[PDB]
Nucleic acid binder design. Sequence first.
DNA 1: TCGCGCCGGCGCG
DNA 2: TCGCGCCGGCGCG
Lengths: 290, 290
Amino acid sequence: TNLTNSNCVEEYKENGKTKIRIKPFNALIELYHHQTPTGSIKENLDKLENYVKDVVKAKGLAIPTSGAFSNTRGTWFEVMIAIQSWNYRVKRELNDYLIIKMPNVKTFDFRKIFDNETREKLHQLEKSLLTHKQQVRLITSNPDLLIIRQKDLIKSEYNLPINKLTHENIDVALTLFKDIEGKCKWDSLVAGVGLKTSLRPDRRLQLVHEGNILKSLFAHLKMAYWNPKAEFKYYGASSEPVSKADDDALQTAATHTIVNVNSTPERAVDDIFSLTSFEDIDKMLDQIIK
Amino acid sequence: TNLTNSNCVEEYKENGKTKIRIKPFNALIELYHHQTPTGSIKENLDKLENYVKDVVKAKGLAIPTSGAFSNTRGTWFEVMIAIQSWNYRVKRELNDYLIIKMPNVKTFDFRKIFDNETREKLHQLEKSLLTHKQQVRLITSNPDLLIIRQKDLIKSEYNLPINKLTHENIDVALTLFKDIEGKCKWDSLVAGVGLKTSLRPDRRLQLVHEGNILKSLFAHLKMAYWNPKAEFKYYGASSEPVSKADDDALQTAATHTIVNVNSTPERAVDDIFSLTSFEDIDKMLDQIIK
DNA sequence: TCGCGCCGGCGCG
DNA sequence: TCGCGCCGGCGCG
């Protein structure tokens, strides 16, 4: 029952004071180093949170703020999803798919996945958009999850499953994006997913912005390569129940598709998934892919 | 120095426990009942926050959570802006403008401001968007601030300035939206503003969604009334410094304007204002209006 | 009851 | 240092 030797929380100094820092990956390793998480997702998140709370208590330290936990829970959910997605393509034996948890736009802009030709197409768009009196851009956060269909990206090292959470295992899932840098043909990118532990009426609209901007960059590519068949879909996924009001908001259109009376309107977010269990991650990936 | 008789915090029961509730309007009245706020905005917000914090301390009660303050600060800033905007149109003598702090989409959907003819134009769009296999919508939060140019809406009661914050004064500013219900011609709506005490890379993109959706509803109206001259602009306003990265994000395009090579692209958010002082609110309104 | 729309406090490079 | 992108906890009808 000894919790005082845990490293899921770290001490550091700032302005002559000792401060507390949650180490979200350490919490995952210290709970899941023999087996990867199973059952209800939300409960595992609360379990991890109550674990760090017990640790700080046992060490006699100040409880981390709600913001620290907001941040921390976001990472847990993403890593749970990234690991489950890694194992999905192994057990399904998807020789030509990758599901990749992306870092932030500054560490690695998702545009860097694309081959030289496609990056130049996007550079032409970006540069022309700035060639006006009123300069415009197309900025969004990196998608949390990207689904890429390209057979020659898959190496045999990806075909070893993750049965336990180590520093080494979490590292490989979270640096997967590095292997595909400058290698994806434009239509290899088939889907992205936004991952949220919970939704708010304000925060759910960030999923619409994301889908809208991504589908707008993709529609440019479809015209630059005059391909009417290639599709890019954008999805949402919550760990909580999704309400009617959440559902309506996320039916919102990618606005460039609704200008004309005889256009068929596209949703910016094609579907929203309520991931109750780890089995639901597999279910979600089944729908997105097949 | 007696803080124990203050009503800026309220006690209420929930599951056999006594809970604390900030009363954000009471905090404003108890600080500004002789004169309306002046000087630096951010400092007045911190002043109001430190006032309720001193009150709970003096009463020996639990300090409200950061979420309670997040909520509370949002209301203070909006009311400060609403009151300053009320006084702006008086001192400028804008006989044909109203600046209105809107409630939420459920209390009063901003679409209800419009006259019967324009509401039917939007109902045709909404209903047709649902008349597909994949149903789509155009959902956003209500704009925080709306600027309406229509001379016949202005009554003489609006021309009395607000020199002190009472329950009665805050009520009139915050129910102003009720007077214009079903009265605005479509092109009377000239601007909306999103008001934020601070920005985040995620949260600032909600201003882009808002602008994008609003300009998409307005572009429909421009076509339904075949008017190439009518404009609707969308603006942001922070109480903190705005960074280069905030600036870039909010240069993002209303995506329906960038489809074609010879389109002139429009920003979804036309400008972002950093409101340091109350004088800056006046400055901002000067640019938006004239 | 919950729906709305608010925003602060992160861990990490 | 700050930029990224995370999300919980509201007051109110």
